[PDB]
RNA sequence: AACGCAGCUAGCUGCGAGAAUUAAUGUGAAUUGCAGGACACAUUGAUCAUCGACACUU
RNA sequence: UUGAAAAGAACUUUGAAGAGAGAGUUCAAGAGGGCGUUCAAACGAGAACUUUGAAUCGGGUUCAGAUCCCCGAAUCUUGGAAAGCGUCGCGGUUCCGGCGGCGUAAGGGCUGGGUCGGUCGGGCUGGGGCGCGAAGCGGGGCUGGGCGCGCGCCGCGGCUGGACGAGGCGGCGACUCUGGACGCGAGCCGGGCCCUUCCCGUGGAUCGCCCCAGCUGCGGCGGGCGUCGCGCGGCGCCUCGCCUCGGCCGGCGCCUAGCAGCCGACUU
């Protein structure tokens, strides 16, 4: 499990050919985006909830998006 | 049907392999129908299929070896099963031609002095 | 007596060549006579018993004139079963009594192609036995 | 105690209400046969008409149990009983001159009628049936009248059993070894005071003796074979099960628990078929465990030798204080079968001959009772 | 009737021993037809099979006494049964004093109350068992400093 | 100055080695493969704890021959039934057979493959 | 020597993944503890004997 | 080593049984299968002894295997709370064997050893901006009125099945009641939708806060004097009572036989 600090290199790590699914978990304080790939489950931890609804909308098609809340 | 052995002996290999590997299907099905209780109408057939699968394979092999005898007839060397196997020490025995060779001295003494058929009176 | 050095007059060997003899030779041990009229249609004296041919007992408890046909030949125990020769088991069911084929005479012969050989093979051999008397 | 006997009017009215709906659908389905009608379609048609007219009657009252007691069973020449096929099973397109045995039952309020009949496909009205078919069918029909008239109160199972033996072997045929003709009660399709025929020694040493009593409702089944009378299953899949109530076992497999709970939600201790579940795979792999742990008793389809003809007649009968009484009878014309062999035992001839002139009315037996003291 | 099976599976799904597994003696028949784990778990939420609480080993007999041996009530001359080297090791006391005295003597070096030419003198004074405890080393420094600050006068 | 040896030990030279080219084959025909697909798998299992596997774990279990490894089991289940095998496991059971836990692919379902076979 | 093979089988017996036997030749209606299924008995043959063909795991 | 042949003991009867008593087969059964710790309850027939109760890793799973099977990760935080565990509650009794709530005397050590002004963390105020009950907007729906709707409660009508009384010196026809199921009389009463209306969501103003702008001080307490009130309270000065909000820098200020507070052990 790697932890991605910035948002810009999360979209390219999610729009790779081998990235299988995205699972979004909304905690109390923050929202964790989790993308499953061949080797790693990458995690993006972000707290600003106005950006979390932006980032769900800005996701590539054909990529599974099952929320966990 | 009646899987007769002399019936099968005129055929080619493909239909002897066709009729084999579907007979190997029903034997596999009866073994499925033997582990689920079954019924003697099905389970008295297991021997009927097995001794028929044994019958098709012998008609294959007897015809296969028959073609190998026909091919290595006039050869100096045959493979080590296409040559006869009476017993071991009867293969170390001399062949018929060399089993009675007489030297040139020997067949002069048999030519000049043959055994005569005499008869002694009294 | 017996002037053959290669067959035995031994008791325990004649019994062993009988009580575990193979079952095709065991067929002809279980032979049987004919009637006095069916030795005249054919020219045979005795003949091996068959699954289905009419027969009658001549010795034993079931002695009678009832022409009842053979319904089983059972070579493992040297015995045959007759149709109307049965016996009431005490249960209520009814079992057969088995009798030895030397004790029954055949008054009707199940005739087909394999019988017509062995009934003509035994027939030709009994005229050859009558030309050694001339 | 709570469960009522036949000592009420509505009880016998429900027995009539089951028997005549079974007779109506049975006559319509026998007439609706031809050379070619799919057996699966026949079983669907039978359970469809039973469901149709069960939905027609008594629908004001929301809690009354009524419907398919015993599902439709359509057997064959060689076959014996209980042949209800499936969707994935192999079906027989029917054909000229085939022994068809039709069996079905209807329950009202836990009161059960069962009826079976045996006949020939498409013998024409000018043409007549001969041979060993006619031999075994007239054999089983005289066994049917021997059951219909040799059962009276005070008897045992032994008399009718060992008269069936003489009837069928005067026809030179044989009753199949080990059947049970059943005691019927309230929600109980099989009690214990029954009828055996042709028993083996353990199953008759353990067959507990009993006496025909009064206020009693029995179903009689006759399956006479034109051969040896020793039937056994051939690997054909049993599709009819019933629920045995006293058994308690908690199933480990989720599939079998779902199956056994749906059985509780659809029919409590009633016989049924696997077609009703319409996703039969889950039902098959549940019913394996259910049949293994004695929770469903099966109705195993049996056959006999190739070339056989086994004839079946099943009817219920009711014990009044007048005696036994016929409530159902399969539609049979005994004149069409030409059998050279028949019953030759002269006492049994007169015994079966006596009741042939008796089946005229059901009131002439009581009408002459006032005339007994007249001379 | 015989519940050796149902006692064993219950202790597994409760993660306890069989000592702490209570079966209901009135509803024996509902417990007795339980051949699986899920059917045991069914009878635990339904309150027939109960995990008993642990038996009481309280510390109240031995904690009051700790509060009295914190004050010295049970020590005495005749409640001790080891040597004074086995009760409190005499190495550990020396290995404690030299922690205490060298650290306070190191406190005065970077706080500039003593120079090095007294610290290295007094370090060997501590080593040789001259100074009994901390309130003896400390005013020995105060008298030692004052006369040395008087040799500057 | 040509026959020179700077090595103080006479190591044996390397002579040419021909390969075999015999006058006649030793045995008559190549033998027929006796451990084919129909002899790998003997029968499937139908026990009640084998039925915790078909629905609840998506797998068949067969009794296969002891001389069969997991590639020969995988090639056989695919060949007989035209299906897709995920992974296979084995254990030689104390009766002396070899019980294989072949797991089918998640696209396939073992409830319907056991339907075509017939243990259902 | 070891291990395997019977519908119901552990021992003895027989046999080798063609596994209580296949083919061929005689013979000519059974084997049998229970069953089942072949078997016009010449549109070819159950059974047993023979044994020359074929096969024969470690 | 039964007997010629299994004809190897049907049936009845006592017993939970092994075992017997009649009966039957046989020339023969003097031939019957090696034969010429305590107490109580439960199940059981039977209780001192039975059972129940009282004295390469993580997670799950079986009647029996799991670092091997499934799920998931791999070769303070991501994994991580979506899992476990502790409680609390609903549904349900072989689908039910499912789901939600809340929680997780002596012996030592730590800080500061200080006065005041400039700077900063700041604390505070003005201009502008942000969140909102409520007027209002989009509207969802247990409200207030109407309509199809319960294939209803109660009673009525007709049809059909069943049953019964009666009778002939083996012969058949007539009479009456009720059950099913329908229709009728809305006489009766229960479940949903349409309009303001009950009810939340969004944008602007007060009110609460923040950005920008102004200074290194701002917010708050107690006693005497004055003292007024529409449950809430309040005010101005002095203070030998006050916290001087604190850090860095700088005239500015030195405990010095060493304090002040805080914590903490077991020993003699």
Author numbering:
A (entry chain Lk): 2 to 70
B (entry chain Lh): 2 to 123
C (entry chain LY): 1 to 134
D (entry chain A): 7 to 381
E (entry chain LR): 2 to 154
F (entry chain LX): 37 to 156
Question: Would you copy out the relevant sentences from the publication that reported this structure?
Answer:
To gain insights into Ebp1 binding to the human 80S ribosome, we used cryo-EM single-particle analysis, and determined the structure of full-length Ebp1 (p48 isoform) in complex with puromycin-treated 80S ribosomes purified from HeLa cells. The MetAP fold of Ebp1 as determined by X-ray structure analysis binds to the 80S ribosome as a rigid body (root-mean-square deviation (rmsd) for 352 Cα-atoms of 1.0 Å) and thus the model could be directly fitted into the cryo-EM density (real-space correlation coefficient (cc) of 64%). Ebp1 binds with its concave surface, harboring the active site in MetAPs, directly on top of the ribosomal tunnel exit and is sandwiched between the exit and ES27L. Ebp1 establishes contacts with ribosomal components all around the inner ring of the tunnel exit, including proteins eL19, uL23, uL24, and uL29 as well as the 5.8S rRNA (helix 24) and the 28S rRNA (helices H24, H47, H53, and H59). The single and pronounced exception is rRNA helix H59, which undergoes significant remodeling upon Ebp1 binding, identifying it as a conformationally dynamic adaptor on the 60S ribosomal subunit. In the human Ebp1–ribosome complex, ES27L is resolved in the exit position and the ES27L-B-arm (370 nucleotides, 2912–3281) reaches over the 60S tunnel exit as previously only observed for 80S complexes from yeast. The ES27L-B exit position is stabilized by an extensive contact of 1000 Å2 with Ebp1 (overall Ebp1–ribosome interaction surface: 2500 Å2) and an additional smaller contact with eL38. The ES27L-B model allows for the definition of three specific Ebp1–ES27L contacts. In our cryo-EM reconstruction, the C-terminus of Ebp1 is resolved and projects toward the widened major groove, where it forms an α helix (αC) with the highly basic lysine cluster (S363RKTQKKKKKKASKTAENA381, helical region in italics, side chains not traceable) that entirely fills the groove. In the Ebp1–ribosome complex, docking of the insert domain of Ebp1 to uL23 constitutes the largest interface to the inner tunnel exit ring (500 Å2).
